[PDB]
Design a protein around this ligand. Structure first.
Ligand code: HEM
Length: 152
């Protein structure tokens, strides 16, 4: 649960992402894969990537970063009223992709890391607080659907 002022911060931060969605999405995925190499094994289409240079050169990885962040941005713009948008993603990630909730924690922290890396000094303490709460709400509502499905 976020206040109006916290949502305002979230959507202000998101404007930074929307200026370069593919560059942000690429770096989020690279931070996830290099920091937590077990996550790469969930992607049949990226498991061939052995080095970060290959990851950086992959146009399909940048494409997938755009897909991921476009979906997250659509959820964030709902300011918590995201049941219809979140349900299909929870279902596909539990039943088809088999993504443990832990990996959603990993990517949440990676988003925070990339924002500081690309906007040093321009991602203030209030903005980090609000973004973190929004990603926690997203993860918690996914977790509720995972529990319904019995997925661990
Ligand atoms: C911010 C969190 C994330 C968002 C918004 C997101 C969004 C999406 C979307 C929109 C798709 C395509 C449609 C679908 O299959 O449902 C997708 C595919 C996928 N997601 Fe996620 N995702 C997230 C986190 C992750 C994480 C943490 C992993 C694994 C570590 C992951 C693994 C996958 C895989 C394996 C696919 C299928 C890729 C393919 O072969 O084309 N997702 N995701």
């Amino acid at each position: 649960g976020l206040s109006d002022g916290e949502w305002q911060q979230v959507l202000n931060v998101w404007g930074k992402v929307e200026a370069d969605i593919a560059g942000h999405g690429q770096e989020v995925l690279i931070r996830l894969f290099t920091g937590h190499p077990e996550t790469l094994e969930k992607f049949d289409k990226f498991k061939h990537l052995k080095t970060e240079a290959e990851m950086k050169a992959s146009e399909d990885l940048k494409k997938h970063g755009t897909v991921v962040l476009t979906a997250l941005g659509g959820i964030l713009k709902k300011k918590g009223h995201h049941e219809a948008e979140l349900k299909p993603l929870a279902q596909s990630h539990a039943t088809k992709h088999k993504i443990p909730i832990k990996y959603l924690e990993f990517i949440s922290d990676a988003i925070i890391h990339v924002l500081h890396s690309k906007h040093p000094g321009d991602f203030g303490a209030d903005a980090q607080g609000a973004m973190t709460k929004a990603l926690e709400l997203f993860r918690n509502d996914i977790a509720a659907k995972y529990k319904e499905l019995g997925f661990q």
